[PDB]
Amino acid sequence: TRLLAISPHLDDAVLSFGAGLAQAAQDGANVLVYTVFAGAAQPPYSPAAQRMHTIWGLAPDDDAVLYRRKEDIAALDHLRVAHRHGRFLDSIYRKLPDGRWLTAHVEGRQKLAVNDHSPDSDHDLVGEVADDIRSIIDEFDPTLVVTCAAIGEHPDHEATRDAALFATHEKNVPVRLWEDLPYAVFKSGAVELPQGFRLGSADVSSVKPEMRSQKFQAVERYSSQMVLLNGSENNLFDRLDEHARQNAPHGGYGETTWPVVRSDDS
Numbered sequence: 001t002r003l004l005a006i007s008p009h010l011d012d013a014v015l016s017f018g019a020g021l022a023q024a025a026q027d028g029a030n031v032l033v034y035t036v037f038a039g040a041a042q043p044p045y046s047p048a049a050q051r052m053h054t055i056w057g058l059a060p061d062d063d064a065v066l067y068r069r070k071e072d073i074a075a076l077d078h079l080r081v082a083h084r085h086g087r088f089l090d091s092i093y094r095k096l097p098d099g100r101w102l103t104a105h106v107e108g109r110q111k112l113a114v115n116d117h118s119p120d121s122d123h124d125l126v127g128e129v130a131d132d133i134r135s136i137i138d139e140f141d142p143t144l145v146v147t148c149a150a151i152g153e154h155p156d157h158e159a160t161r162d163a164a165l166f167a168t169h170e171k172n173v174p175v176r177l178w179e180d181l182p183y184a185v186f187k188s189g190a191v192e193l194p195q196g197f198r199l200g201s202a203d204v205s206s207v208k209p210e211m212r213s214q215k216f217q218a219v220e221r222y223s224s225q226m227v228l229l230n231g232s233e234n235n236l237f238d239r240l241d242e243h244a245r246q247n248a249p250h251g252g253y254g255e256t257t258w259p260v261v262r263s264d265d266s
């Protein structure tokens, strides 16, 4: 088994699929977690990025990508799986064709806004990510690819998912999507896939308590993300446990994944 997990950001694969990854490794699978939006960023940073850096417990002008890459390596090391850090800039570092930042902070609004931009610029990014994923598929030769469902609709998650769908379709490798966590705790779960693709029936895994423990410990390696993920209740792991319990009231911990298959008449 050669399992390629494609994470949009430095944390998503561990949060959503860390128990699956750890179990795969223990079972003897060759596991590689490739993060798309791990590209190096350097000042000057936008006000919005500087705001995020502060929330992440860094100085505004710190090399946040470096800090997060080190966290990712620590977390994946904990799960005993390999990492690969991609070249694409997180949405907080990207610019529009016109020179404006992609993401902006709006005074008095907690949620960051995305500036409108061309259909072409979106298509081009997905195309580039798909190119890189096709190259990794050639290099790693996975028997299975898993990436995010993009529940929560983060643009980076949607770009990752779509590019993975295109690349795996072209290369004829099976693909599954994980339920994005913690997003799925506060979203409906329904997603809109690119034309021609649809989800098959869900699998809800049953993971041994040791795997849950190992996942949760790995999550804690993402120090920069903890305050943000824990919320005003300090209850990330409680919420993840409850979500798992909902989906398997007769079980222990688990993670929901769906196969992606071709739609009828496509």
Ligand SMILES: CCCCCCCCCC(=O)O
Binding pocket: 009, 010, 011, 012, 090, 091, 092, 103, 112
């Ligand atoms: C426009 C939103 C800013 C992008 C922030 C990406 C940070 C990673 C957190 C996550 O993976 O969920």
Ligand SMILES: [Zn+2]
Binding pocket: 008, 009, 012, 154, 157
């Ligand atoms: Zn993410």
